[PDB]
Each structure stands twice: as C-alpha cells, then as structure tokens.
Amino acid sequence: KVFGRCELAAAMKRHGLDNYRGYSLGNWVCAAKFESNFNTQATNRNTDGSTDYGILQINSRWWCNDGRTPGSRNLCNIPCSALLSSDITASVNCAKKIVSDGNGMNAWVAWRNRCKGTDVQAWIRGCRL
Numbered sequence: 063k064v065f066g067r068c069e070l071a072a073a074m075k076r077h078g079l080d081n082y083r084g085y086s087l088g089n090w091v092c093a094a095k096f097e098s099n100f101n102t103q104a105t106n107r108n109t110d111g112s113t114d115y116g117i118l119q120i121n122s123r124w125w126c127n128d129g130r131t132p133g134s135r136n137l138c139n140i141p142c143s144a145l146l147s148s149d150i151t152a153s154v155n156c157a158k159k160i161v162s163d164g165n166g167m168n169a170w171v172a173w174r175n176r177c178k179g180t181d182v183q184a185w186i187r188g189c190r191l
C-alpha cells in the first residue's frame with residue numbers, strides 16, 4: 063500500500079504513535095516519507111546482508127526474522143514479512159520498541175539526516191486528525 067501523507071498520519075495516530083516517546087506525529091510521517099515514500103512494501107538490502115522492511119524500514123539485523131541475516135536478532139518477535147502489510151500495526155508496534163531502545167528516533171538514519179530539527183509539523187499540515 064502507498065499511503066497519502068494525511069492518511070498515514072491518521073493511521074499512525076490510530077495506532078498510538080502520535081507523541082510516542084515525545085515524538086510528534088510529523089516526526090513519524092517525515093521518517094516514513096524518507097524511509098519508504100509511504101510504501102508499506104518497501105524493502106532495501108544493506109551492505110552487511112541485513113534487509114530493511116516496510117514503511118519505517120525496520121532492519122532484520124535486530125528487529126525481525128527474515129531467515130537470511132546471520133547472527134541477527136528478532137527483538138520485535140515477528141517475521142520481517144509482517145512489516146510489509148497494508149495494515150501498519152506490526153510496523154508501529156515494532157517502531158515503539160526501537161524508539162524506546164535508547165537513541166530515540168536517531169535509530170532511523172534518514173530521520174536524523176532529513177527530519178531532525180526541521181519543521182516536521184508541515185508533514186501533518188492541513189490533515190483532519
């Protein structure tokens with residue numbers, strides 16, 4: 063599924079991400095925009111053989127099981143395929159664990175490089191939330 067900007071903001075709010083760990087909804091929408099362009103089915107291989115999955119590009123090195131990332135963990139206790147669903151529940155639940163892990167949203171390098179410190183409220187501007 064390719065979400066619209068306000069459609070995703072609304073789904074993230076429905077699943078309790080808005081202001082989760084103090085990160086406003088615009089932070090989460092911005093992260094999704096630059097990680098996946100709002101596409102739930104986005105997958106990207108990393109140099110080290112791990113793969114990033116879904117709207118928030120969650121990495122098989124730590125968070126999900128894809129069966130092909132040697133020495134990796136599965137801390138969200140999910141198959142990485144669950145992160146590609148049209149329903150964002152699994153991606154949101156897992157993202158809540160990642161952002162709780164100690165470095166907040168810096169875990170998303172695209173968030174640090176493209177969203178952190180910017181006018182992230184623009185991402186939810188005009189949305190009926």
Ligand SMILES: [Cl-]
Pocket residue numbers: 067095
């Ligand atoms: Cl957009």
Ligand SMILES: [Cl-]
Pocket residue numbers: 086087088089182183184186
């Ligand atoms: Cl915001």
Ligand SMILES: [Cl-]
Pocket residue numbers: 127128129130131132133134
């Ligand atoms: Cl594996």
Ligand SMILES: [Cl-]
Pocket residue numbers: 134135136137
């Ligand atoms: Cl594990």
Ligand SMILES: [Cl-]
Pocket residue numbers: 127128140141142
């Ligand atoms: Cl699995």
Ligand SMILES: [Cl-]
Pocket residue numbers: 073148149150151
């Ligand atoms: Cl959803």
Ligand SMILES: [Cl-]
Pocket residue numbers: 083084165166167
């Ligand atoms: Cl933080």
Ligand code: NA
Pocket residue numbers: 122123124125126127128131134135136
């Ligand atoms: Na894994």
